Amino acid sequence: TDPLYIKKICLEKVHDWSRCNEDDVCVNQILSGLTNQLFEVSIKEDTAIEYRITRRHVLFRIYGKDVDALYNPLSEFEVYKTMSKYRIAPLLLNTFDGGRIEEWLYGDPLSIDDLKNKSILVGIANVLGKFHTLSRKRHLPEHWDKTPCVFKMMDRWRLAVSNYKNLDKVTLDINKYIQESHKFLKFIKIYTQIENIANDIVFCHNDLQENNIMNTNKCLRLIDFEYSGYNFLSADIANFFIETTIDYSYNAYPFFIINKKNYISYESRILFVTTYLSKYLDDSTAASDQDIIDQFLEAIEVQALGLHLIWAFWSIIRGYQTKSYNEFDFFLYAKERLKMYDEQKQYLMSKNIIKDYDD
Ligand SMILES: [Mg+2]
């Protein structure tokens, strides 16, 4: 993590960069987690034009430790290589002792305000619709577990949360939501057997938020596939719809803002689902049926219910890992996702959508 060592590695692992020396290379650490240290590494532009280096930037990733990973760290690299092969993720460039080097994407992540732009929403639906056709249009590795990660994420993170003895003010009754977790997984096992396109099991990103969508040339691209895996495709869309209400760009405590009124509008949700199905169904994109759309939208809201529990548990675990480094209040965030669960459960009950859920 010493900058000159980073320069030395890049000069010998990026093609034609060895024509430079360490004084031609710039290293800028970008925001990292506990599992990663990320650096923007570049050749100074005037040095680049003189030597005519065409790959001026790379992304330099130093691996953390597996035990701190809340995703699955043992299969993350194999999954990323597959995504890189089919040009879905940023291109893997090289590996080194303790990390890897990836293509640098020029542009900016989408903002919370970009998700109000209807043209941006259409672009996102096209990208995700085409992306979700991967498992049926190409042959993904046959040994990959096809269990929907809604089960795996919920099970894995509920276990880690129940192993805590503190749990003071995240909720006074954590086992209420631990028992709610069991209710959702049992309901979703029945609910997803109903014939619904939204219940199709495809390879999913599973962390669809605006800052994981890059806007490069007006071509939207996905990044950060660490949580990716097989899942109900409605879960990927439900995550994106939820994220229209959460702003992570706020730069003071608690470093997030929730605006439930900003939830993607119904006409926007229609426009998204129609656009999505136009790309996800190929030989007959005849899914302009409103009853198919209205049922697509209902399955999305059902999956949204469980995502609030999934990410609340994730946030509880992150809160016990961190300790005033970014000062993002993971415990307040978890409490807000738990509140989102209660409000979503009430709404679904009020419309009789989660029958036999046993409140
Ligand atoms: Mg990210």
Side-chain angles (χ1 to χ4, degrees):
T1 198
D2 160 57
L4 195 88
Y5 194 55
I6 289 182
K7 302 192 189 196
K8 294 201 182 122
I9 293 181
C10 278
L11 286 170
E12 86 171 47
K13 299 272 174 184
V14 178
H15 161 69
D16 253 28
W17 275 32
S18 78
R19 274 223 79 212
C20 305
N21 62 68
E22 291 86 329
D23 297 316
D24 300 321
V25 181
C26 293
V27 173
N28 293 131
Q29 175 153 21
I30 59 189
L31 251 193
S32 322
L34 287 56
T35 41
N36 295 145
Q37 269 202 313
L38 288 179
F39 301 86
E40 171 187 0
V41 182
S42 66
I43 302 300
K44 303 173 161 153
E45 41 186 0
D46 289 350
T47 299
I49 310 153
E50 182 175 60
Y51 292 178
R52 267 180 312 249
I53 298 165
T54 55
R55 184 180 302 281
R56 197 158 80 76
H57 292 77
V58 300
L59 178 65
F60 192 92
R61 172 178 318 268
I62 307 181
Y63 295 145
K65 308 125 64 192
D66 290 359
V67 303
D68 300 347
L70 298 200
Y71 53 87
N72 191 338
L74 311 176
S75 55
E76 184 267 346
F77 182 60
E78 179 187 348
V79 167
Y80 168 49
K81 283 204 280 74
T82 305
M83 294 306 108
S84 170
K85 156 182 173 58
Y86 296 121
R87 302 306 271 125
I88 291 181
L91 180 70
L92 166 69
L93 297 181
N94 217 332
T95 56
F96 59 87
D97 204 297
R100 61 172 184 249
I101 300 167
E102 310 162 6
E103 165 191 21
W104 180 266
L105 297 205
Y106 289 108
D108 307 293
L110 291 186
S111 84
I112 191 57
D113 293 321
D114 290 329
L115 304 195
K116 299 163 188 182
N117 185 302
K118 285 201 160 54
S119 303
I120 298 278
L121 290 179
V122 164
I124 289 171
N126 283 323
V127 167
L128 179 87
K130 174 173 163 41
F131 161 68
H132 279 166
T133 70
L134 177 77
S135 63
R136 83 170 188 256
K137 299 230 185 193
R138 330 227 71 164
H139 270 188
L140 301 189
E142 301 191 3
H143 68 285
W144 280 5
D145 182 11
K146 307 241 289 186
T147 300
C149 302
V150 53
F151 298 108
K152 302 205 289 185
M153 294 186 299
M154 184 80 82
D155 281 333
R156 179 198 331 154
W157 297 340
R158 185 199 43 231
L159 175 70
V161 161
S162 68
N163 284 356
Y164 293 138
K165 65 279 190 162
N166 316 266
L167 309 153
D168 277 30
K169 188 42 43 214
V170 168
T171 167
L172 264 168
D173 207 70
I174 183 61
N175 65 77
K176 185 226 295 215
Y177 295 103
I178 295 167
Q179 292 316 121
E180 292 302 306
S181 155
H182 294 297
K183 300 181 186 172
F184 176 78
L185 289 189
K186 294 182 340 203
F187 174 85
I188 211 64
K189 275 162 187 151
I190 297 167
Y191 181 86
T192 52
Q193 273 139 0
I194 304 164
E195 182 196 349
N196 190 341
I197 307 187
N199 289 336
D200 287 357
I201 297 174
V202 301
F203 192 82
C204 276
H205 180 278
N206 291 323
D207 189 18
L208 268 194
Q209 37 176 311
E210 61 271 7
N211 82 336
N212 285 332
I213 309 178
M214 291 294 296
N215 181 18
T216 63
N217 66 57
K218 275 301 317 162
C219 160
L220 308 179
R221 297 182 56 170
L222 306 179
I223 61 161
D224 294 354
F225 285 74
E226 282 86 3
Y227 300 90
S228 64
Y230 282 105
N231 213 350
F232 309 107
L233 61 84
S234 39
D236 258 359
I237 303 186
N239 207 89
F240 171 68
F241 285 5
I242 287 163
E243 278 294 340
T244 60
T245 58
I246 310 167
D247 173 18
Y248 300 109
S249 267
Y250 191 62
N251 193 40
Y253 175 90
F255 298 90
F256 67 91
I257 294 174
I258 290 172
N259 284 289
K260 302 165 165 166
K261 294 67 43 173
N262 278 359
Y263 186 71
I264 177 182
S265 91
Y266 183 68
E267 69 145 359
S268 268
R269 281 185 262 123
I270 293 164
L271 174 60
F272 193 95
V273 166
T274 62
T275 308
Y276 174 89
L277 298 168
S278 97
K279 286 291 193 284
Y280 174 73
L281 316 170
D282 40 8
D283 206 280
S284 207
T285 86
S288 39
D289 187 308
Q290 264 277 339
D291 301 328
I292 295 286
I293 299 169
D294 291 310
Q295 208 162 230
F296 206 91
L297 292 169
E298 172 193 286
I300 288 165
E301 297 295 326
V302 172
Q303 297 289 345
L305 187 64
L307 292 176
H308 295 312
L309 292 179
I310 283 167
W311 291 116
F313 297 157
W314 176 91
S315 193
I316 292 173
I317 302 161
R318 294 281 292 113
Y320 281 115
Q321 297 183 328
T322 60
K323 200 102 157 282
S324 294
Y325 313 105
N326 184 233
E327 310 225 279
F328 184 99
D329 197 335
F330 290 103
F331 294 135
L332 181 66
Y333 185 80
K335 195 162 182 253
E336 294 283 347
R337 298 304 297 264
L338 287 181
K339 186 180 167 193
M340 287 182 171
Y341 174 83
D342 296 322
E343 298 173 331
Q344 182 74 3
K345 173 180 187 187
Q346 181 256 310
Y347 162 74
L348 296 169
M349 291 264 305
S350 88
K351 307 305 281 192
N352 199 40
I353 293 175
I354 43 179
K355 314 171 222 63
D356 303 347
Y357 197 87
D358 299 331
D359 192 301

